[PDB]
Amino acid sequence: HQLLSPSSFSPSATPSQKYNSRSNRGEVVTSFGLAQGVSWSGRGGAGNISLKVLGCPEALTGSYKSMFQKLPDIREVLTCKIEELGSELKEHYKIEAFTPLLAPAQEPVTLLGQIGCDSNGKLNNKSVILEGDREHSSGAQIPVDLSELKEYSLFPGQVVIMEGINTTGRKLVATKLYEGVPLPFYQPTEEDADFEQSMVLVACGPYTTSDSITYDPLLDLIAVINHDRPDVCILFGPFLDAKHEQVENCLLTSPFEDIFKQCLRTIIEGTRSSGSHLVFVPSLRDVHHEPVYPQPPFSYSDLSREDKKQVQFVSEPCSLSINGVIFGLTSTDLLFHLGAEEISSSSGTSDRFSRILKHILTQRSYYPLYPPQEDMAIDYESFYVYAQLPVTPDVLIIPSELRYFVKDVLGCVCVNPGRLTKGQVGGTFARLYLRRPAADGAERQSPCIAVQVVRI
Amino acid sequence: QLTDEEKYRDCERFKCPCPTCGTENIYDNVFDGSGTDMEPSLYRCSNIDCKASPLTFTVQLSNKLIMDIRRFIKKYYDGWLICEEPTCRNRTRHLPLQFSRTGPLCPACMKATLQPEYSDKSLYTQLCFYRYIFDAECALEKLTTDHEKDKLKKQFFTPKVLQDYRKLKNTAEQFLSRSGYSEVNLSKLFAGCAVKS
Amino acid sequence: DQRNASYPHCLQFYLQPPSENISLIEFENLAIDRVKLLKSVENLGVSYVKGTEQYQSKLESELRKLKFSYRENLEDEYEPRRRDHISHFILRLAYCQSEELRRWFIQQEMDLLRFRFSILPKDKIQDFLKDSQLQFEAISDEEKTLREQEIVASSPSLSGLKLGFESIYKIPFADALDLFRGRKVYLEDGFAYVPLKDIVAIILNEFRAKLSKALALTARSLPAVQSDERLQPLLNHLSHS
Amino acid sequence: LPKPGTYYLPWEVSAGQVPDGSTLRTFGRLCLYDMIQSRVTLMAQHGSDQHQVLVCTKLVEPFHAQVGSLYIVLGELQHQQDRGSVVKARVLTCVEGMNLPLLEQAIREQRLYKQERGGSQ
């Protein structure tokens, strides 16, 4: 019952026999929490589920005028971000005043600025320049020396508060580096704790191999969802990858929008039997969508009345609330970019992934890196409006090309199920368990209890 | 006062390989040739040996057009800045925060001002060009003699050809209906008057 | 009902600036249409004598051709009034450089408003006066009979004891300049007594002239910020077309 | 010939240390431009406190106002009944990216040399 018809799109669909030759199906590579002795079963959407969108006071719902940018707007956005973060840090840390960058002095001073690189290459411990805020330093630049710093962790576009001695006003010798202050957690309400138990499935694209348009992994995932009967299903893009070999050469014989609509119809009609909730998160690799971050939601006007209550489309990125548990959804490969563009020094062994996740959490932004990667487009007004973290999410989801992992950083669970397909072989997806903890505990208990990364 | 040829002088011409013979077909106008050779650019392939009608490849042409438009949009949004100083020519993506009376100050020489490498005007002109070469109605209306227009409509421009041209034109008009370069905000224009809001 | 609330009357004083977003092509077309209408109004005024029938008929035809708002209909007049409003504001932006251009623009606008007012029904005149900020004062009947002979002698378009069934208005002498100039109104201790028709016509024209002059002077300080690369060829071409 | 424009720091002008009618030249960051009354408000940040300078610009219009840019104002100070003190600008030029600490150091050096030269009489 493959509603999607690869033969109807292109006459050159040859399935990858390697994927069909797999034999390690159902293997749980890794787990976390109370995942031992617990069977994974849900109500199949027959219970009570609440979905909401939070974040900016105006959630992204429609498109916007895009192909028009001016430098003063970008400068204003950057200055406002730097000033707000610096003011919050100063108020939290009880600092007296910020010395201007170009003012020389013989005594230790506290400065505020943005970490940047003076060259077009990667950052290193010898080419770091601090760029201060407009109000306090008129956007001046001054090289920074980290030879006297015991520990540090920097990437371009990071807002830091540094203390040191600036004798000449043209070079600063580092002596300290304040740590980021995470946002406060969400406060549950009476209705949030009313939900007893539910579990959520998460998967990310692409849904095909590198040599076929059969979408066999999509059918396997649909069958898995039907068998398991989960509560809420969240599927990431891209649904029609623009890096596919067939799509790049324009060998498809059908319009992109029609193919995407057929795929959506296939998914919805396959998952109707389970009765769960579906959420679709757009990605920048879709070939029939605007390549600008943030991204307006998907459009599909052929929905049935019943399917409206079970099929939902959200923006990219989106902060989704499920039964009072805040989720952080983003399809961008933040971890890969940050790892490629990060430098640090440690006196002992440390986890790079934990450091990157902590930097993401403490920057109060979904894309703290600046300048962005060479293959990304950002609309800075829309980015400043619709891409801000409201609060620290209880559960954070971020697919990436790196190795799958489940980690707890600063009380926020980070899950990276990874791609569903890796070249011509199957990948992995994840399943989450959500139980509201008792309110009699001394400290806030993590609602997420069990997470399993299941091979597909 | 500028003509169509002068207005779109710097626009990159659309090129699509013929699926049958593989040879590319450079498109620059609705009609190719002058004089007695009034023929749609999609009617015949460049290769005389090739007999495949390019009009049969409407879906492939639309897909290639979408890919090209996406590539141009991504190219514009990269934001490359080049120093105006002839002796500096600094090329960077990092926008300096130390502005001046005119624009950003180049950190390499500290005497000149950076300029965008690919301005929004060029991108809008490119999109308008990609709409222009697939508008058969305007091309027919531009014909001086009505008898020649009627003859061309009868011999070649069947309603299906007009529908295909409309589809191709809509493929670019969809992107063109989101640009902020063709939408004036009167609220900011008349923000200086507050006697009556 | 935003449509009728925004544009309830054909006559306007052009106080509220527009606040919506429009495309560039419509902007240019509106500017060109209003400049053509102004030139046609000037030519019609110069060629004929103000009033008559042929002049007003040709003006009505010109207004109808350029899809503007001149008459009063209960259905589908949002578009002409909106076009008139936006085009007038664009022309005001384009015509605030020199004294001569300001004088010409004010003259043409005053003539157009005078015609549109002359083609209006009486209750519509009262409603339009109420809608705008002007408030007038009517003297009592005792005062009216106390100064009947002087008003009749001045004869502000009144002949043969026609003071009856009329309302006499009291206004400062600095606002009745048109009538005050050529001994067509009775002046007493700093006030002018005017019959209804003359007071509405002349005082509305004068107040509109003063308000338009003040607002154009205010808008003169704006184009120092009009460094936009767009709208610049249009403004330059329209300045000395 | 107008009186010379001596330098004055914003926190000296805002503290009422300048007599009426004195000609002064100060600096600050633009914040507002009320076109109806042609009034411009400037602040300069000293430490953790903000001081304001009001400038009437009736003699320099038309004007291109940029919010958030440094300005240098030359004019005569006038005391008003309710609006405090307002500077009637004669020349108002836009400077962006000036090294402010260098300017203050130069001002103090000039004042010190003037005091030293005046100490012999």
PDB file of C-alpha atoms in Angstrom, chain C residues 29-241:
ATOM      1  CA  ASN C  29       0.625  55.901 -11.590  1.00  0.00           C
ATOM      2  CA  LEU C  30      -1.147  57.807  -8.807  1.00  0.00           C
ATOM      3  CA  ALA C  31       1.450  60.586  -8.890  1.00  0.00           C
ATOM      4  CA  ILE C  32       1.166  60.922 -12.675  1.00  0.00           C
ATOM      5  CA  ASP C  33      -2.641  60.844 -12.596  1.00  0.00           C
ATOM      6  CA  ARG C  34      -2.885  63.569  -9.968  1.00  0.00           C
ATOM      7  CA  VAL C  35      -0.372  65.831 -11.718  1.00  0.00           C
ATOM      8  CA  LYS C  36      -2.370  65.423 -14.942  1.00  0.00           C
ATOM      9  CA  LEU C  37      -5.585  66.247 -13.077  1.00  0.00           C
ATOM     10  CA  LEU C  38      -4.013  69.376 -11.575  1.00  0.00           C
ATOM     11  CA  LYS C  39      -2.769  70.577 -14.966  1.00  0.00           C
ATOM     12  CA  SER C  40      -6.192  69.933 -16.512  1.00  0.00           C
ATOM     13  CA  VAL C  41      -7.866  71.875 -13.693  1.00  0.00           C
ATOM     14  CA  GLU C  42      -5.512  74.818 -14.226  1.00  0.00           C
ATOM     15  CA  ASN C  43      -6.084  74.833 -17.992  1.00  0.00           C
ATOM     16  CA  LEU C  44      -9.869  74.629 -17.592  1.00  0.00           C
ATOM     17  CA  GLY C  45      -9.834  77.466 -15.067  1.00  0.00           C
ATOM     18  CA  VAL C  46      -7.703  79.689 -17.292  1.00  0.00           C
ATOM     19  CA  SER C  47      -9.612  78.978 -20.516  1.00  0.00           C
ATOM     20  CA  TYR C  48     -13.167  79.469 -19.228  1.00  0.00           C
ATOM     21  CA  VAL C  49     -14.718  81.600 -16.473  1.00  0.00           C
ATOM     22  CA  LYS C  50     -15.193  79.894 -13.112  1.00  0.00           C
ATOM     23  CA  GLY C  51     -18.765  78.693 -12.761  1.00  0.00           C
ATOM     24  CA  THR C  52     -20.953  78.417 -15.876  1.00  0.00           C
ATOM     25  CA  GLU C  53     -21.917  74.966 -17.186  1.00  0.00           C
ATOM     26  CA  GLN C  54     -19.360  73.924 -19.815  1.00  0.00           C
ATOM     27  CA  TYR C  55     -16.471  74.429 -17.380  1.00  0.00           C
ATOM     28  CA  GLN C  56     -18.042  72.290 -14.660  1.00  0.00           C
ATOM     29  CA  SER C  57     -19.111  69.638 -17.187  1.00  0.00           C
ATOM     30  CA  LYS C  58     -15.588  69.353 -18.604  1.00  0.00           C
ATOM     31  CA  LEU C  59     -14.157  69.226 -15.077  1.00  0.00           C
ATOM     32  CA  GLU C  60     -16.587  66.434 -14.175  1.00  0.00           C
ATOM     33  CA  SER C  61     -15.622  64.508 -17.314  1.00  0.00           C
ATOM     34  CA  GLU C  62     -11.922  64.923 -16.500  1.00  0.00           C
ATOM     35  CA  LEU C  63     -12.473  63.725 -12.930  1.00  0.00           C
ATOM     36  CA  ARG C  64     -14.466  60.699 -14.107  1.00  0.00           C
ATOM     37  CA  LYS C  65     -11.886  59.733 -16.741  1.00  0.00           C
ATOM     38  CA  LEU C  66      -8.997  59.690 -14.243  1.00  0.00           C
ATOM     39  CA  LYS C  67     -10.965  57.401 -11.851  1.00  0.00           C
ATOM     40  CA  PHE C  68     -11.162  59.879  -8.976  1.00  0.00           C
ATOM     41  CA  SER C  69     -13.876  60.790  -6.466  1.00  0.00           C
ATOM     42  CA  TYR C  70     -16.130  63.705  -7.405  1.00  0.00           C
ATOM     43  CA  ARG C  71     -19.760  62.636  -6.882  1.00  0.00           C
ATOM     44  CA  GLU C  72     -21.618  61.000  -3.979  1.00  0.00           C
ATOM     45  CA  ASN C  73     -22.748  57.385  -4.355  1.00  0.00           C
ATOM     46  CA  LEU C  74     -23.774  54.924  -1.659  1.00  0.00           C
ATOM     47  CA  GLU C  75     -21.937  52.001  -3.308  1.00  0.00           C
ATOM     48  CA  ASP C  76     -18.271  51.468  -4.220  1.00  0.00           C
ATOM     49  CA  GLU C  77     -16.568  54.806  -3.665  1.00  0.00           C
ATOM     50  CA  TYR C  78     -13.734  53.480  -1.475  1.00  0.00           C
ATOM     51  CA  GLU C  79     -11.312  53.141  -4.392  1.00  0.00           C
ATOM     52  CA  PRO C  80     -11.601  56.702  -5.823  1.00  0.00           C
ATOM     53  CA  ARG C  81     -11.355  58.341  -2.396  1.00  0.00           C
ATOM     54  CA  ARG C  82      -8.371  56.164  -1.458  1.00  0.00           C
ATOM     55  CA  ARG C  83      -6.643  57.024  -4.736  1.00  0.00           C
ATOM     56  CA  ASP C  84      -7.318  60.735  -4.210  1.00  0.00           C
ATOM     57  CA  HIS C  85      -5.918  60.624  -0.666  1.00  0.00           C
ATOM     58  CA  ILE C  86      -2.741  58.725  -1.539  1.00  0.00           C
ATOM     59  CA  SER C  87      -2.092  60.705  -4.729  1.00  0.00           C
ATOM     60  CA  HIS C  88      -2.541  64.027  -2.926  1.00  0.00           C
ATOM     61  CA  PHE C  89      -0.072  63.024  -0.223  1.00  0.00           C
ATOM     62  CA  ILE C  90       2.455  61.855  -2.833  1.00  0.00           C
ATOM     63  CA  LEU C  91       2.111  65.133  -4.742  1.00  0.00           C
ATOM     64  CA  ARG C  92       2.513  67.099  -1.504  1.00  0.00           C
ATOM     65  CA  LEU C  93       5.746  65.196  -0.894  1.00  0.00           C
ATOM     66  CA  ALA C  94       6.900  65.948  -4.443  1.00  0.00           C
ATOM     67  CA  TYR C  95       5.898  69.648  -4.454  1.00  0.00           C
ATOM     68  CA  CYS C  96       7.655  71.070  -1.371  1.00  0.00           C
ATOM     69  CA  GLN C  97      10.924  72.466  -2.764  1.00  0.00           C
ATOM     70  CA  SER C  98      10.456  76.109  -3.826  1.00  0.00           C
ATOM     71  CA  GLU C  99       7.976  78.896  -3.148  1.00  0.00           C
ATOM     72  CA  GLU C 100       6.598  78.987  -6.702  1.00  0.00           C
ATOM     73  CA  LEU C 101       5.778  75.268  -6.727  1.00  0.00           C
ATOM     74  CA  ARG C 102       4.094  75.558  -3.324  1.00  0.00           C
ATOM     75  CA  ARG C 103       2.000  78.512  -4.497  1.00  0.00           C
ATOM     76  CA  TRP C 104       0.921  76.718  -7.677  1.00  0.00           C
ATOM     77  CA  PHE C 105       0.035  73.535  -5.779  1.00  0.00           C
ATOM     78  CA  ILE C 106      -1.982  75.461  -3.182  1.00  0.00           C
ATOM     79  CA  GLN C 107      -3.820  77.372  -5.916  1.00  0.00           C
ATOM     80  CA  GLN C 108      -4.791  74.212  -7.799  1.00  0.00           C
ATOM     81  CA  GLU C 109      -5.838  72.400  -4.617  1.00  0.00           C
ATOM     82  CA  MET C 110      -7.976  75.364  -3.551  1.00  0.00           C
ATOM     83  CA  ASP C 111      -9.696  75.456  -6.946  1.00  0.00           C
ATOM     84  CA  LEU C 112     -10.415  71.715  -6.867  1.00  0.00           C
ATOM     85  CA  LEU C 113     -11.784  71.903  -3.319  1.00  0.00           C
ATOM     86  CA  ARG C 114     -13.941  74.887  -4.281  1.00  0.00           C
ATOM     87  CA  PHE C 115     -15.494  72.940  -7.158  1.00  0.00           C
ATOM     88  CA  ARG C 116     -16.071  69.801  -5.076  1.00  0.00           C
ATOM     89  CA  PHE C 117     -17.691  71.974  -2.399  1.00  0.00           C
ATOM     90  CA  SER C 118     -19.856  73.759  -4.973  1.00  0.00           C
ATOM     91  CA  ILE C 119     -21.249  70.412  -6.156  1.00  0.00           C
ATOM     92  CA  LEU C 120     -22.312  69.326  -2.649  1.00  0.00           C
ATOM     93  CA  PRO C 121     -25.804  69.120  -1.088  1.00  0.00           C
ATOM     94  CA  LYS C 122     -26.665  71.300   1.892  1.00  0.00           C
ATOM     95  CA  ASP C 123     -26.985  68.630   4.586  1.00  0.00           C
ATOM     96  CA  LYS C 124     -23.767  67.140   3.220  1.00  0.00           C
ATOM     97  CA  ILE C 125     -22.135  70.556   3.714  1.00  0.00           C
ATOM     98  CA  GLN C 126     -23.289  70.609   7.334  1.00  0.00           C
ATOM     99  CA  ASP C 127     -22.085  67.042   7.938  1.00  0.00           C
ATOM    100  CA  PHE C 128     -18.714  67.767   6.309  1.00  0.00           C
ATOM    101  CA  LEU C 129     -18.279  70.882   8.453  1.00  0.00           C
ATOM    102  CA  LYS C 130     -19.096  68.840  11.562  1.00  0.00           C
ATOM    103  CA  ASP C 131     -16.642  66.103  10.558  1.00  0.00           C
ATOM    104  CA  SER C 132     -13.722  68.506  10.215  1.00  0.00           C
ATOM    105  CA  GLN C 133     -12.302  70.560  13.071  1.00  0.00           C
ATOM    106  CA  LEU C 134     -13.965  73.881  12.187  1.00  0.00           C
ATOM    107  CA  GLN C 135     -16.605  75.188  14.592  1.00  0.00           C
ATOM    108  CA  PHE C 136     -18.645  78.284  13.752  1.00  0.00           C
ATOM    109  CA  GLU C 137     -20.742  80.685  15.823  1.00  0.00           C
ATOM    110  CA  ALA C 138     -24.181  81.961  14.805  1.00  0.00           C
ATOM    111  CA  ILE C 139     -25.446  85.268  16.173  1.00  0.00           C
ATOM    112  CA  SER C 140     -28.863  85.488  17.807  1.00  0.00           C
ATOM    113  CA  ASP C 141     -31.974  86.918  16.169  1.00  0.00           C
ATOM    114  CA  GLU C 142     -31.848  89.963  18.457  1.00  0.00           C
ATOM    115  CA  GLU C 143     -28.342  90.749  17.209  1.00  0.00           C
ATOM    116  CA  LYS C 144     -29.438  90.001  13.634  1.00  0.00           C
ATOM    117  CA  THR C 145     -32.180  92.633  13.780  1.00  0.00           C
ATOM    118  CA  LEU C 146     -29.881  94.978  15.715  1.00  0.00           C
ATOM    119  CA  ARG C 147     -27.494  95.150  12.725  1.00  0.00           C
ATOM    120  CA  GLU C 148     -29.783  94.469   9.762  1.00  0.00           C
ATOM    121  CA  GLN C 149     -29.319  97.773   7.923  1.00  0.00           C
ATOM    122  CA  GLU C 150     -25.515  97.615   7.920  1.00  0.00           C
ATOM    123  CA  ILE C 151     -25.448  94.014   6.672  1.00  0.00           C
ATOM    124  CA  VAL C 152     -27.946  94.792   3.905  1.00  0.00           C
ATOM    125  CA  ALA C 153     -25.952  97.889   2.919  1.00  0.00           C
ATOM    126  CA  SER C 154     -22.746  95.854   2.690  1.00  0.00           C
ATOM    127  CA  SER C 155     -24.741  93.409   0.508  1.00  0.00           C
ATOM    128  CA  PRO C 156     -22.723  90.165   0.821  1.00  0.00           C
ATOM    129  CA  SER C 157     -24.708  88.626  -2.048  1.00  0.00           C
ATOM    130  CA  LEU C 158     -27.921  89.789  -0.340  1.00  0.00           C
ATOM    131  CA  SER C 159     -30.434  92.003  -2.149  1.00  0.00           C
ATOM    132  CA  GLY C 160     -33.738  93.452  -0.985  1.00  0.00           C
ATOM    133  CA  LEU C 161     -34.092  92.713   2.744  1.00  0.00           C
ATOM    134  CA  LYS C 162     -33.044  89.097   2.196  1.00  0.00           C
ATOM    135  CA  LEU C 163     -31.705  88.844   5.762  1.00  0.00           C
ATOM    136  CA  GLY C 164     -34.707  86.731   6.748  1.00  0.00           C
ATOM    137  CA  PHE C 165     -34.380  82.944   6.923  1.00  0.00           C
ATOM    138  CA  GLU C 166     -30.590  83.264   7.137  1.00  0.00           C
ATOM    139  CA  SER C 167     -27.967  82.626   9.808  1.00  0.00           C
ATOM    140  CA  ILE C 168     -25.299  85.298  10.309  1.00  0.00           C
ATOM    141  CA  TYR C 169     -21.887  84.081  11.471  1.00  0.00           C
ATOM    142  CA  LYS C 170     -19.308  85.927  13.573  1.00  0.00           C
ATOM    143  CA  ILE C 171     -15.658  85.400  12.610  1.00  0.00           C
ATOM    144  CA  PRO C 172     -12.336  87.137  13.220  1.00  0.00           C
ATOM    145  CA  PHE C 173     -11.444  89.673  10.546  1.00  0.00           C
ATOM    146  CA  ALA C 174      -8.193  87.849   9.714  1.00  0.00           C
ATOM    147  CA  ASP C 175     -10.038  84.860   8.201  1.00  0.00           C
ATOM    148  CA  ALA C 176     -12.458  86.651   5.826  1.00  0.00           C
ATOM    149  CA  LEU C 177      -9.657  88.114   3.706  1.00  0.00           C
ATOM    150  CA  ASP C 178     -11.323  87.371   0.356  1.00  0.00           C
ATOM    151  CA  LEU C 179     -14.543  89.228   1.219  1.00  0.00           C
ATOM    152  CA  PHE C 180     -12.836  91.749   3.520  1.00  0.00           C
ATOM    153  CA  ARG C 181     -10.489  92.837   0.719  1.00  0.00           C
ATOM    154  CA  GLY C 182     -13.066  94.492  -1.524  1.00  0.00           C
ATOM    155  CA  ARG C 183     -15.754  95.804   0.857  1.00  0.00           C
ATOM    156  CA  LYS C 184     -18.143  92.846   0.691  1.00  0.00           C
ATOM    157  CA  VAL C 185     -18.710  92.324   4.432  1.00  0.00           C
ATOM    158  CA  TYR C 186     -19.677  94.470   7.419  1.00  0.00           C
ATOM    159  CA  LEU C 187     -16.867  94.899   9.959  1.00  0.00           C
ATOM    160  CA  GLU C 188     -17.497  95.873  13.577  1.00  0.00           C
ATOM    161  CA  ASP C 189     -14.965  95.981  16.447  1.00  0.00           C
ATOM    162  CA  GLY C 190     -12.798  93.256  14.923  1.00  0.00           C
ATOM    163  CA  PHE C 191     -15.428  90.818  13.645  1.00  0.00           C
ATOM    164  CA  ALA C 192     -17.057  90.164  10.272  1.00  0.00           C
ATOM    165  CA  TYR C 193     -20.731  89.282   9.795  1.00  0.00           C
ATOM    166  CA  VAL C 194     -21.203  86.969   6.810  1.00  0.00           C
ATOM    167  CA  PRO C 195     -24.260  85.189   5.352  1.00  0.00           C
ATOM    168  CA  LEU C 196     -24.244  81.416   5.110  1.00  0.00           C
ATOM    169  CA  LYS C 197     -23.124  80.819   1.515  1.00  0.00           C
ATOM    170  CA  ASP C 198     -20.259  83.314   1.534  1.00  0.00           C
ATOM    171  CA  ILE C 199     -19.079  82.262   4.992  1.00  0.00           C
ATOM    172  CA  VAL C 200     -18.898  78.555   4.171  1.00  0.00           C
ATOM    173  CA  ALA C 201     -17.234  79.032   0.784  1.00  0.00           C
ATOM    174  CA  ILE C 202     -14.678  81.719   1.633  1.00  0.00           C
ATOM    175  CA  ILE C 203     -13.854  80.655   5.193  1.00  0.00           C
ATOM    176  CA  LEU C 204     -13.453  76.992   4.240  1.00  0.00           C
ATOM    177  CA  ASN C 205     -11.169  77.977   1.358  1.00  0.00           C
ATOM    178  CA  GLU C 206      -9.058  80.251   3.575  1.00  0.00           C
ATOM    179  CA  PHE C 207      -8.747  77.762   6.444  1.00  0.00           C
ATOM    180  CA  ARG C 208      -7.812  75.015   3.982  1.00  0.00           C
ATOM    181  CA  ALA C 209      -5.175  77.281   2.429  1.00  0.00           C
ATOM    182  CA  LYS C 210      -3.639  78.083   5.818  1.00  0.00           C
ATOM    183  CA  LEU C 211      -3.604  74.450   6.956  1.00  0.00           C
ATOM    184  CA  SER C 212      -2.141  73.212   3.665  1.00  0.00           C
ATOM    185  CA  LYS C 213       0.567  75.889   3.758  1.00  0.00           C
ATOM    186  CA  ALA C 214       1.542  75.001   7.327  1.00  0.00           C
ATOM    187  CA  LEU C 215       1.605  71.274   6.578  1.00  0.00           C
ATOM    188  CA  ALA C 216       3.640  71.717   3.383  1.00  0.00           C
ATOM    189  CA  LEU C 217       6.127  73.827   5.347  1.00  0.00           C
ATOM    190  CA  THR C 218       6.354  71.028   7.919  1.00  0.00           C
ATOM    191  CA  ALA C 219       6.836  68.422   5.175  1.00  0.00           C
ATOM    192  CA  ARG C 220       9.629  70.556   3.689  1.00  0.00           C
ATOM    193  CA  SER C 221      11.878  69.385   6.538  1.00  0.00           C
ATOM    194  CA  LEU C 222      11.338  65.738   5.476  1.00  0.00           C
ATOM    195  CA  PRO C 223      13.057  65.252   2.063  1.00  0.00           C
ATOM    196  CA  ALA C 224      16.447  65.711   3.735  1.00  0.00           C
ATOM    197  CA  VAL C 225      15.887  62.081   4.803  1.00  0.00           C
ATOM    198  CA  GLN C 226      14.692  60.976   1.329  1.00  0.00           C
ATOM    199  CA  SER C 227      18.022  59.400   0.422  1.00  0.00           C
ATOM    200  CA  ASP C 228      16.267  56.238  -0.785  1.00  0.00           C
ATOM    201  CA  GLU C 229      17.642  54.987  -4.090  1.00  0.00           C
ATOM    202  CA  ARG C 230      14.047  54.294  -5.103  1.00  0.00           C
ATOM    203  CA  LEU C 231      11.518  57.110  -5.647  1.00  0.00           C
ATOM    204  CA  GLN C 232      14.464  59.356  -6.540  1.00  0.00           C
ATOM    205  CA  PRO C 233      14.120  59.190 -10.356  1.00  0.00           C
ATOM    206  CA  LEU C 234      10.364  59.649  -9.955  1.00  0.00           C
ATOM    207  CA  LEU C 235      10.780  62.702  -7.721  1.00  0.00           C
ATOM    208  CA  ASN C 236      13.418  64.235 -10.004  1.00  0.00           C
ATOM    209  CA  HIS C 237      11.329  63.688 -13.143  1.00  0.00           C
ATOM    210  CA  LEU C 238       8.147  65.005 -11.515  1.00  0.00           C
ATOM    211  CA  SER C 239       9.908  68.100 -10.153  1.00  0.00           C
ATOM    212  CA  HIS C 240      10.659  69.496 -13.633  1.00  0.00           C
ATOM    213  CA  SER C 241       8.513  67.409 -15.981  1.00  0.00           C
TER     214      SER C 241
END
